[PDB]
Amino acid sequence: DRINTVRGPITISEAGFTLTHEHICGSSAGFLRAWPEFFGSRAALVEKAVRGLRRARAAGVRTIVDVSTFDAGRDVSLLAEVSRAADVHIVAATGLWEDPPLSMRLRSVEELTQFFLREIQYGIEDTGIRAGIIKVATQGKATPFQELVLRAAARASLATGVPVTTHTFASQRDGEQQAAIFESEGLSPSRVCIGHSDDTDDLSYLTALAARGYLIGLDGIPHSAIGLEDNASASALLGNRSWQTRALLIKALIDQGYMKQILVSNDWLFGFSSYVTNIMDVMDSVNPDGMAFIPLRVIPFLREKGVPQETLAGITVTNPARFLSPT
């Protein structure tokens, strides 16, 4: 019936148009509190995120899923503040991303399961805010620790019904190994979104996963360093494929019959400290629409390609609701 957000539980019908892979701030544990001047100030970051989320709201977005984990610097009090002041629901995440500190990397699968369950069932830190999704990551073949995280995420999902969403190196087909580990724990593919799947052009990789029941996260549509070819760091992070190429993978999976399993997002942020210093300004300079890019640019592009309204509403409303509802 209910999805946990940073403002409390909401009914499934209240989620509406939902972006399923977003960030208020991509950082590191403790960093925003220790060095807020990196972002100008905490107050400036709040103002920027509220302005950006209000723009997405005006474009039709009603909910975002912030898939920042502990080690990506999730500050759930920031999420709550920005959610309240933009009147946009925010679902918070547990799990671990690609930068776990020693106090996490030394933990057993049983210990990690307890930590994920704490954030889902009890709350994050001392805030009482409960996570509504579990985030995990690989970058190619899983490290031994990442195998533990994937298993703990599966166990936490089985205990609570909250879904699992993943970071992949899509061009190394990471979703296949993630799926194998999840299924070895008894997790239903319908509880799993294989993310960053628009980073690859290998449609056969994506359709094979979708034919097994997985959700496919086409979540980085505006990420492109076209026009930034003299910028090595932006090119390495954003890639040289266009947003149109990424968006046409949405149409391709629709055309192949998988509209009920597509999840679309921007993978945008309003602050970004875990990469080179200038990256947030560079990213903003090529996508000023920010999180409004999906509703303002991708939807009109697909509609004029012939995707009907019912299909676009199915992808942006029905699929996230089915995914997020604890099952």
Add this chain to the structure above:
Amino acid sequence: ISEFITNSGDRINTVRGPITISEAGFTLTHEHICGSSAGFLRAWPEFFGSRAALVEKAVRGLRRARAAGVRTIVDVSTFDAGRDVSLLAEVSRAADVHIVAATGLWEDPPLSMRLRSVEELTQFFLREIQYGIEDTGIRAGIIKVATQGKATPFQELVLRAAARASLATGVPVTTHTFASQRDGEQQAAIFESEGLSPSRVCIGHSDDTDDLSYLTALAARGYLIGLDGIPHSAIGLEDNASASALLGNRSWQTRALLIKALIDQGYMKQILVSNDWLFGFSSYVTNIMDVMDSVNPDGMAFIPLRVIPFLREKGVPQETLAGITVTNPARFLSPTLRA
């Protein structure tokens, strides 16, 4: 005369505010309340039982050290070692033991630090010394840095940023070494290329090595020698591989006799001693704090209760031991003039 006056004079920053140099007293220069990771104590306090259990454990431990004569500890936990200065302030008030907090970076920096330039790191260290840590207003009184063998390129940047922050603020620098790889020599070279005075640098974990020529060469150059892990020993724990790997096979007596050896060779003024103890420990294996507590129940009181009597009956005068534990830290922690 001025050794006796506590109601006025120059001051050092603690988690409870500024104190005069004379108030510092018996000072342990390398300790931890909790060895963790950034944000970890707040995200998963049940790892330590509870935050309140950790507080009570630390307060009892500090009171034990205080009854043994300790008046001040330097908590050399950085941001990435999970320093929680609000925890430090709470336990300092409850135990009435002064705590100096640290800036710098240790061996587990996150991406948001690893990607930063020397200039950016300099600004972060200056923020924590000149403005305060997080939103607490508590100012760091020492800069902590680390190598584990030959420095990585990032570790070099950290050492240079530490030196620049030290010159700009007057606060001293203290280091983590892999002592058997002679890390202090490369650290010294980098520090000296930045113009930092050796008398403002403690080369830490120096009791992990038996190579006296390495230590006396650094002390002869004016460096402070941190003999800071005296009770760390896995003797009796040989079937415990994780405890053996962390604590080593050398006895506390062997470590303590390095203190006497440096005294005997004329380097008393260059020695700093400590326990490198903690009351919570999450950045290693799960059982490690209970294991460590089982072989050193005295905790931070090990230096006053065990090392001082051992050295005294070996003929080290009381006044020499008081110079090492009171005067030497006072000179180290007292800020010098800014550049």
